[PDB]
């Protein structure tokens, strides 16, 4: 009937008029700002310009560095994230002891604020204040160098983002009926030849959705790198690059250029992932 | 048999340690005074509240916690009502368009925030909506809608289907049928969606750090990140760890009380029991 569709459209109206507005009008204003040049110190020189900002950021030399940094971080974080999340999901499902304690402990880092975790990993790896910096050669300072800092960021990111991967994998892995596993065991499949034959290729959609979400989430990391290294020592990500540019150079042109480029990179990654899902 | 018992007793302790080491580090770092700040995770020196009695001295962190609680409550209320509308729409009735709405409700879930706060910080600099509770509730309830829709569509597909007919066959007007047969059946869903949306919208750092500038409407994570150059200088370690602990306590409370339903809501109602 028409009344049912009217009711559905009325219930849908607020959600969509908020989503589309706050998601599309800002990005449209962003591309329109990128087509111009600004300066937050003098908003009077608003003369129009071409695509000079795009070819400026793309060929400056410091945009591809941040791009490579964030791609390295997202790949070497999503790999570990998937491995550890599968392990933790198998733990949370197949356990004989009190699973309530395990699930509560695993939920604790899921909801914790991403600034307490980062100020924990900052004062752990600090030489003289924490322990993970004393369990090293003296005067190591594993946070004022390029690759040690990338490693600390990857560790914090894995510890923080693993619980939701584990919960998604458990949501997928709790649908596998026990009759399937019993039949696989009766046929001859061992412990591992059951996994990668009846339970791993069976939850394909759960793994794919969780992996896409975790990739597009790790592609935008700002907190860990902001309050763990500060973007200095050339270990700044892409989000930190855009934020630093806009809020310490007051150049809205390059800021919005980098913004649109980040959105386009995320779109390209998502489209490739759906193409080779 | 002892092999499997030991291997299940050493894998749960492993998980709990993995999950509670970098939180107990915050705790043991914030409890110690400005002495013996050297190594030691087992609280080397005696515990004295020489940091908590300093962080709460002034309008530095108390206001930044009040703004956080208020913003979080407003955003969870509004996002839960809007996501409940959308979830009951995409849960039972809407035929024409129930496949691209769940695509937008993922595009904005995987939306890079920095791809959005470069224009907004300009736009919301002209309207005058720079640093006020309106000016943070809008993006918070924008990005908190997918979580609510997910965890509420779960519980909305959970409840059975013949209840509406069994209500209208007894004489119930559709309004009466709804408010007396479905409303009390969707209260757990709404409370768990509120818990989840609060836990989410209560930790966003990029938005609050980009938009807010003054002591009015400045969230707590931004205050913690600003403890470096603020008055609080008896040593930044104690104050920062104290703020981090005061922050992370509500999540500990929420999980310890409602994990049974938080797991069942996050896993889309698949590990109920």
């Amino acid at each position: 009937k028409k009344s049912e569709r009217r009711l559905a459209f009325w219930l849908i109206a607020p959600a969509v008029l908020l989503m589309l507005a706050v998601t599309a009008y800002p990005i449209g204003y962003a591309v329109w700002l990128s087509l111009q040049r600004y300066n937050l110190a003098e908003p009077h020189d608003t003369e129009f310009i071409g695509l000079a900002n795009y070819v400026t950021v793309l060929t400056d030399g410091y945009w591809w560095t941040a791009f490579a940094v964030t791609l390295g971080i997202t790949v070497v974080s999503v790999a570990i994230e998937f491995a550890l999340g599968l392990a933790l999901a198998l733990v949370m499902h197949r356990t004989i002891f009190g699973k309530g304690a395990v699930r509560t402990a695993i939920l604790i880092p899921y909801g914790i604020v991403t600034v307490a975790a980062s100020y924990s990993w900052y004062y752990a790896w600090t030489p003289g204040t924490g322990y993970l910096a004393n369990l090293l050669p003296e005067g190591s300072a594993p946070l004022t160098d390029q690759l040690p800092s990338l490693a600390i960021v990857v560790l914090a990111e894995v510890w923080k983002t693993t619980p939701f991967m584990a919960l998604l994998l458990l949501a997928g892995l709790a649908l596998v009926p026990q009759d399937l596993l019993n039949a696989a065991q009766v046929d001859g499949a061992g412990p591992w030849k059951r996994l990668t034959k009846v339970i791993l290729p069976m939850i394909k959609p759960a793994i794919l959705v969780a992996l896409l979400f975790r990739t597009l989430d790790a592609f935008r990391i700002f907190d860990n790198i902001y309050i763990l290294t500060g973007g200095s020592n050339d270990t700044g990500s892409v989000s930190i690059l855009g934020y630093d540019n806009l809020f310490k150079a007051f150049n809205v042109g390059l800021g919005s250029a980098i913004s649109v480029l980040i959105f386009l990179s995320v779109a390209i990654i998502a489209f490739i992932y759906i193409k080779i899902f | 048999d002892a092999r499997r018992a030991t291997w299940w007793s050493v894998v749960n302790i492993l998980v709990i340690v993995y999950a509670l080491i970098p939180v107990l580090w915050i705790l043991s770092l914030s409890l110690k005074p400005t002495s013996s700040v050297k190594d030691g995770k087992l609280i080397p020196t005696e515990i004295t509240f020489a940091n908590y009695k300093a962080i709460f001295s002034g309008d530095a962190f108390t206001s930044a916690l009040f703004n956080s609680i208020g913003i979080g409550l407003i955003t969870t209320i509004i996002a839960v009502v809007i996501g409940g509308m959308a979830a009951y729409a995409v849960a039972r009735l809407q035929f024409p368009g129930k496949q691209l709405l769940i695509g937008v409700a993922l595009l904005i879930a995987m939306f890079p925030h920095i791809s959005l706060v470069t224009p907004i910080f300009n736009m919301w600099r002209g309207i005058g909506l720079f640093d006020t509770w309106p000016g943070l509730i809008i993006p918070y309830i924008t990005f908190a809608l997918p979580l609510a829709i997910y965890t509420l569509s779960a519980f909305f597909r959970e409840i059975p289907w013949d209840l509406e007919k069994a209500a209208k066959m007894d004489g119930a007007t559709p309004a009466q049928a709804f408010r007396k047969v479905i409303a009390p059946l969707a209260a757990p869903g709404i409370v768990t969606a509120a818990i989840l949306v609060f836990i989410f919208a209560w930790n966003d750092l990029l938005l609050a750090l980009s938009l807010t500038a003054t002591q009015r409407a400045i969230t707590a994570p931004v205050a913690i990140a600003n403890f470096t150059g603020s008055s609080q200088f008896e040593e930044p370690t104690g104050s920062i760890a104290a703020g981090a602990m005061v922050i992370t306590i509500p999540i500990i409370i929420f999980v310890l009380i409602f994990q049974r339903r938080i797991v069942a809501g996050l896993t889309s109602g698949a590990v109920k029991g």
Binding site: - | P160, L163, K165, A166, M169, A172, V181, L185
Partner: protein, 384 residues
């Protein structure tokens, strides 16, 4: 009470139901039976109110009520899934219709206690539908549908979620409770045995049409199709093909002249040698156990028992005769669910005969109870 529905049709935007017409009397246990996907649940919904009739004139009582809402016809429906609210005590489940109809709170309690006393749950009135079993949930649904004292208490396959041993006792309970109540009832059910046990006037439907409307005895002694003939009876009717030998009939295993007047009746509605005779399994019996004076004219033939399932006071000797015979359209649409075999014929022998799996037995078949149908049309020719 008297549900008179004439020319009540329905058309989806195909046609589910078409040309339904009957006068459900004041207090009959009508049964709508038919294969899954028929126009029986749609007829039930159109009587209830959850769907709108296309042609119309449905008269619950003596007035056209095909346009009133379900909340004004005063009819009570119980669903197949026991649609009962899991957030209300059983007393509140049973009292929900009365409080919706605005009954004073001094009478609803009395009516709920009375109804729980009539049923067998007068002590479960403080529990919740989550912690109840199958039979108790079913009786809660029926108590909610009975406490109202409606004008037509109409069920919808309620005994479909119970075990095969509790369903029989529930059939007995329903058929004994409807007398104590005495309200006009209709009932949709897929299996014919329910329609035959608890039923006052069964209605067989196929694809939307109604094949026959008759008592469970006129529906079995006098079927008027291949479908309403091979559909009722759990050992369904054996369907041998046939040809007119000009003096009678010739089945694939024996020849018999039916009867002079029967032959004349068959010759009246002449058919192009396509008349698929049928015989119930209950009319086939071992020759050895056949007393004299009856074996002489019982078409004695022998077959090889493929499987002899002896399950009590009767052994269902299977067998098979080679050839064909499933050569109709009604018969094919009937074997679409049951049968599952071109020529696989059952025969119930009395439990005194000595028959093993794979022996050689002579199955006599009384030639005074064989129903001779038609191939293309489908309509019986012994007794319509």
């Amino acid at each position: 009470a008297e549900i008179v529905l004439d020319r009540v049709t329905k058309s989806y935007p195909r046609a589910a139901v078409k040309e339904f017409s009957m006068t459900i009397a004041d207090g009959e246990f009508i049964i709508l039976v038919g294969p899954s996907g028929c126009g029986k649940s749609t007829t039930l919904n159109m009587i209830a109110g959850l769907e709108e009739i296309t042609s119309g004139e449905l008269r619950i009582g003596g007035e056209r009520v095909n346009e009133k809402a379900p909340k004004d016809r005063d009819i009570a429906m119980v669903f197949q899934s026991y649609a009962l609210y899991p957030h209300m005590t059983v007393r509140q489940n049973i009292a929900f219709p009365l409080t919706l109809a605005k009954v004073p709170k001094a009478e609803i309690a009395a009516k709920v206690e009375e109804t729980a006393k009539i049923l067998d749950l007068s002590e479960l009135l403080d529990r919740k539908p989550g912690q109840l079993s199958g039979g108790q949930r079913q009786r809660v649904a029926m108590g909610r549908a009975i406490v109202r004292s409606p004008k037509a208490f109409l069920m919808d396959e309620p005994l479909s979620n119970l075990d095969a041993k509790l369903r029989v006792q529930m059939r007995a309970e329903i058929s004994r409770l409807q007398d104590r109540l005495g309200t006009t009832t209709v009932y949709v059910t897929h299996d014919q045995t329910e329609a035959m046990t608890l039923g006052d006037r069964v209605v067989v439907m196929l694809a939307g049409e109604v094949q026959q409307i008759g008592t469970p005895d006129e529906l079995y002694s006098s079927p008027a199709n291949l479908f309403v003939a091979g559909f009722i009876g759990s050992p369904a009717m054996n369907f041998f093909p046939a040809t007119r030998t000009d003096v009678g009939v010739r089945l694939p295993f024996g020849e018999v002249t039916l009867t002079p007047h029967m032959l004349d009746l068959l010759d009246k509605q002449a058919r192009p040698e396509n008349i698929i005779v049928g015989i119930r399994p209950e009319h086939i019996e071992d020759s050895a156990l056949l007393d004299g004076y009856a074996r002489i004219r019982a078409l004695t033939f022998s077959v090889r028992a493929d499987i002899v399932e002896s399950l009590g006071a009767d052994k269902y000797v299977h067998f098979t005769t080679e050839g064909a015979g499933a050569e109709s359209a009604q018969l094919a649409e009937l074997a679409a669910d049951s049968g599952a075999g071109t020529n696989q014929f059952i025969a119930r022998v009395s439990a005194d005969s000595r028959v093993r799996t794979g022996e050689q037995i002579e199955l006599a078949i009384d030639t005074t109870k064989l129903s001779i149908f038609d191939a293309a049309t489908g309509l019986n020719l012994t007794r319509d």
